[PDB]
């Protein structure tokens, strides 16, 4: 039916209108104070007033930190940009890691622009170029102008073109009898397809046949666009989208990450501010999530202390599972959660507590009904006892081998014997480690 | 074809109740691991869940990769099976996370439904209109069958495919409209005046009868990585073969995920997940493990199968020793299959099957002595001795391997243990760890 | 280890004429029906009847009377080996290299 992967039984924080966390709501069991703190953080992000606010989710393994991150993402909605990231992703062989971090920082910022578009469209009726006086003169083109006649519903318009537009028109491979669509903002032409006013069944080029477009040939339409600031920076650093030669050859070169300068980002900020001041654009700040932040070294942390102090920085959520560990890139500095103390002073730490037997049992209950499986009560008690004895995750994954072993005996219900058979067939970390210690040749 | 290490394994050897036979499909013994692998096989065949980590652990020469090829052979066609080693991730143009992302996306198959039209008949007239420089091409094709006749219109790709493998007004061609393929089936007109610049001896086929144009539904499976590489830049289809896919941006991947879900919503496509098999998984850095721990939690995640032959040893990138060479976070979200050593009857059955695969006839006493030396030494040595003993017996001009042939093969070619023994009495002849060697014999 | 059979025509060009059709089409010049090309080699001479579409490859490779050419069977697709050695000293200063006239018959099938 549908596919599930270690999540998707979580639909939100499950708070009230007063911010009080109910015990079993939103797919969440327990973690009440952490859910309330994350709800206050969600309201702070919705307030749209602060920049560079950082929190850290600190706890042990299998305690609900990534679940809280996706819960915050689902509470904020699809409008707010959310950028998930693992700490190993910053090490690029193309560009330095500082630029990758700043690229993600700009990617966690949204922008909603209402843009107007000038559109010429219709079915091509005539296509007649006029020649130049001296074609082999070295300077100048072979043609001077091209006359294109477009017709539509209640309209017929005759267009005189420069050579630069007609190069794009012929790059789209138009013909007489074609419905085209010309963008006046960038000179782009889209060839929609053949018109249905002629015969259809006499082609061999798998084409699609469109009716005559409605309205006048010349139009002005309003389009709502959703971009990020990284898109503006990338589109300006490697220019495409013009009909000039440098943008024309920028599409053919192999793309590569470059070090975007501060001057380009300042100019992009100036253009976005001028858009906002005219009542056209709207700024939607978002969240950057860095899971496994202990994989960062001291240089990325030291750049984080400078990148957090900008006046455009997003809200960055960090996660760790470290006790009193040495920071990577150092030899003697030992810090809580693997994060240096110059950054910890700028964070707000949120604790995340372990579970009890009843919480483990009901987590197995929701994971069973989301995976579309039916479990007996005694098998559920045995699974909860395994989850306390070995791990919650091991009891969570053993559900689907139990379902396969139940289906292979022409049955639907999961019984205790299936759980014992899945105990025997599949092992956990502790049993495998005990086999490893008592072994002949490094098993 | 040629004979490889696992050429004798075609399947997993299981019943309808997922119970292993003692000898089936080239696999002997290892009952519990084969039953667990059959459970993983049914888990893949259901296609319901995503991102499960399976670890296969045991001593060397036990049947780890044998189990992996059994799963791959029982998986069937059109389901992806990506097999990588631990050392292929380290690249000079790709980061480790990018290489692992591409290895994850190679294991998810997208099966696309496509409506095509087929045209077969006799060519009556070809008119081709070209420009003076030869760039713009257009024309008409006049094709006929017994009952029908239709003048078509051609474009540049059709004239390019018509000029290649030249058709000459009386040949019978078959046109695929969606794949754009022109296939010449033969010639039926038998034209009298042939200006023979060529040595064509084309087949005499009949003129086809019936409908000229016929619809057909086709299916083809493509991978998620291939769609990403095609959509990344202008010439990405070349980069599917040259490997010039340098760090595909994340925006391409989000748009491809949304479009694949959209194609599922119209019934045009469907998602067929597969198995990614990472052999020698201890040869991965700690950053790769930290990436895998969160890459297993995505909607588009395959079933990851890992094989390890190592004990409590040092994790790469760190300074501590962990079980199986893997950190405890990765071991938390994995289910472990344990594989055990062999008896002597299993070794004998393995050697008999490997002799039958190489088409080499063995005597009884040769089989017992090969079994004894595969018990005392390793099994792979006694499997390697079979072809050498066959060539020795073929030197004497008889097609059966005796005890003398395998005895000569044991004398000529050495084991590991005899090599350690011979090196340790003659340490002066070989170069030591400190660079000292005596080369003079006196 | 790949084996293949090549059927090939080569030799000095004796004549190179595009033959006009019986009924020409309007709006065009030089409506060709076949191209007559005569080949000459050692102990051999043979005149061929070719497709009209070999004439554009004749113009492409810049083939005149006196050059030695290389015609393979199925593709057409002539290519100029060079000029014959019998025309080596018509001019004091020139570049076109001069290769000898080929041996054997003009028609040969080699493995």
């Amino acid at each position: 039916v549908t596919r599930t992967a270690a999540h998707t039984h979580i639909k939100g924080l499950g708070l009230d209108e007063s911010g009080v966390a109910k015990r079993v709501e939103g797919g969440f069991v327990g973690q009440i104070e952490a859910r309330e703190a994350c709800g206050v953080i969600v309201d702070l992000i919705k307030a749209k007033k602060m920049s560079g606010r950082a929190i850290l989710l600190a706890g042990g393994p299998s305690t609900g930190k990534t679940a809280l991150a996706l819960a915050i993402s689902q509470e904020l909605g699809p409008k707010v940009p959310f950028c998930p990231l693992v700490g190993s992703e910053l090490y690029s062989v193309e560009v330095k890691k500082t630029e990758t971090l700043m690229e993600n920082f700009r990617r966690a910022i949204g922008l909603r622009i209402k843009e107007t578009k000038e559109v010429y469209e219709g079915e091509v009726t005539e296509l007649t170029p006029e020649d130049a006086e001296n074609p082999l003169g070295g300077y100048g083109k072979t043609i001077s102008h091209v006359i294109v006649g477009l017709k539509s519903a209640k309209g017929t318009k005759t267009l005189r073109l420069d050579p630069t537009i007609y190069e794009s028109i012929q790059r789209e491979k138009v013909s007489i009898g074609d419905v085209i669509y010309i963008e006046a903002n960038t000179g782009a032409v889209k060839r929609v397809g053949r018109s249905d006013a002629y015969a259809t069944e006499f082609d061999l080029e798998t084409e699609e046949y469109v009716p005559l477009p409605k309205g006048e040939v010349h139009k002005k339409k309003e389009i709502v666009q959703d971009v990020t600031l990284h898109d503006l920076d990338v589109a300006n650093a490697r220019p495409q989208g013009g009909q000039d030669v440098i943008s024309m050859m920028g599409q053919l070169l192999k793309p590569k990450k470059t070090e975007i300068t501060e001057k380009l980002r300042q100019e992009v900020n100036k253009v976005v501010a001028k858009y906002i001041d005219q009542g056209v654009a709207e700024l939607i700040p978002g969240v950057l999530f860095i899971d496994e932040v202990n994989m960062l070294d001291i240089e990325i942390f030291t750049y984080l202390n400078k990148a957090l102090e900008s006046n455009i920085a997003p809200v960055v959520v960090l996660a760790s599972n470290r006790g009193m560990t040495t920071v990577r890139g150092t030899e003697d500095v030992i810090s809580p959660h693997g994060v240096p103390p110059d950054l910890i002073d700028r964070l707000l730490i949120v604790r995340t507590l372990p579970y009890d037997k009843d919480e483990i049992r009901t987590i197995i209950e929701r994971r069973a009904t989301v995976e579309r499986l039916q479990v007996e009560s005694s098998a559920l008690d045995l699974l909860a006892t395994m989850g306390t004895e070995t791990s919650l995750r091991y009891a969570l994954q053993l559900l689907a081998p139990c379902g396969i072993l139940a289906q292979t005996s022409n049955r639907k219900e999961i019984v205790v014997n299936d759980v014992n058979e899945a105990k025997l067939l599949f092992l956990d970390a502790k049993r495998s480690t005990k086999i490893l210690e008592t072994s002949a040749n490094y098993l | 074809s040629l004979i490889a290490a696992h050429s004798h394994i075609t399947g997993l050897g299981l019943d309808e109740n997922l119970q292993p036979r003692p000898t089936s499909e080239g696999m002997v013994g290892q009952l519990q691991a084969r039953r667990a692998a059959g459970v993983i096989l049914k888990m893949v065949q259901n296609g319901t869940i995503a991102g499960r980590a399976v670890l296969v652990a045991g001593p060397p020469s036990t049947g780890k990769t044998a189990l992996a090829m059994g799963v791959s052979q029982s998986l069937g066609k059109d389901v992806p099976f990506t097999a990588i080693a631990g050392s292929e991730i380290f690249s000079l143009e790709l980061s480790k996370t990018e290489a692992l992302t591409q290895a994850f996306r190679k294991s998810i198959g997208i099966k696309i439904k496509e409506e095509t039209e087929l045209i077969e008949g006799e060519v009556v007239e070809i008119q081709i209109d070209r420009s003076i420089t030869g760039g713009h091409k257009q024309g008409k094709l006049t094709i006929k069958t017994t009952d029908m006749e239709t003048i078509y219109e051609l474009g540049n790709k059709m004239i390019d495919g018509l000029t290649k493998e030249k058709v000459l007004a009386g040949d019978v061609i078959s046109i695929d409209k969606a794949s754009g393929k022109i296939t010449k089936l033969g010639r039926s007109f038998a034209r009298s005046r042939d200006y023979d610049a060529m040595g064509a001896d084309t087949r005499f086929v009949q003129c086809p009868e019936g409908e000229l144009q016929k619809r057909k539904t086709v299916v083809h499976t493509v991978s998620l990585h291939e769609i990403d590489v095609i959509n990344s830049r202008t010439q990405g289809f070349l980069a599917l073969f040259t490997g010039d896919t340098g760090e595909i941006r994340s925006e391409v991947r989000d748009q491809i995920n949304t479009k694949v879900a959209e194609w599922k919503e119209e019934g045009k496509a469907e998602i067929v997940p597969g198995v990614l098999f990472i052999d020698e998984v201890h040869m991965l850095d700690i950053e790769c493990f930290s990436f895998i721990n969160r890459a297993l939690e995505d909607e588009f995640a395959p079933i990851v199968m890992m094989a390890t032959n190592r004990g409590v040893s040092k994790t790469r990138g760190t300074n501590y020793k962990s079980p199986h060479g893997l950190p405890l976070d990765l071991l938390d979200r994995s289910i472990i299959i344990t594989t055990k050593s062999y008896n002597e009857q299993e070794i004998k059955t393995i050697l008999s099957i490997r002799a039958q695969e190489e088409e080499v006839e063995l005597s009884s006493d040769a089989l017992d002595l090969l079994t004894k030396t595969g018990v005392e030494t390793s099994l792979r040595y006694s499997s390697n001795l079979i072809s050498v003993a066959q060539q020795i017996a073929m030197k004497r001009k008889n097609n059966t391997v005796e005890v003398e042939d395998v005895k000569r093969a044991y004398l000529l070619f050495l084991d590991s243990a005899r090599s350690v023994k011979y090196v340790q009495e003659n340490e002066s002849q070989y170069i030591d760890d400190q660079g000292n060697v005596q080369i003079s014999i006196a | 280890r790949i084996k293949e059979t090549k059927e090939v025509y080569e030799g000095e060009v004796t004549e190179l004429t595009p033959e006009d059709a019986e009924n020409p089409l309007g709006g065009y010049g030089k409506t060709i029906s076949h191209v007559i090309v005569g080949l000459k080699s050692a102990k051999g001479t043979k005149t061929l009847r070719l497709d009209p579409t070999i004439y554009e490859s004749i113009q492409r490779e810049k083939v005149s009377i006196g050059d030695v050419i290389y015609i393979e069977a199925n593709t057409g697709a002539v290519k100029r080996v060079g000029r014959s050695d019998a025309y080596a000293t018509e001019f004091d200063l020139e570049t076109e290299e001069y290769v000898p006239l080929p041996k054997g018959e003009v028609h040969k099938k080699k493995e």
Partner: peptide, 28 residues
């Protein structure tokens, strides 16, 4: 009713005709 076929325009372009008995090639 039957829709008209798309107009065909080949002006200033060579032509290659291939029939049962004879092949032409009109050039400029």
């Amino acid at each position: 009713f039957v829709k008209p076929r798309r107009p065909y325009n080949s002006e200033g372009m060579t032509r290659i005709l291939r029939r049962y008995e004879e092949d032409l090639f009109c050039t400029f």
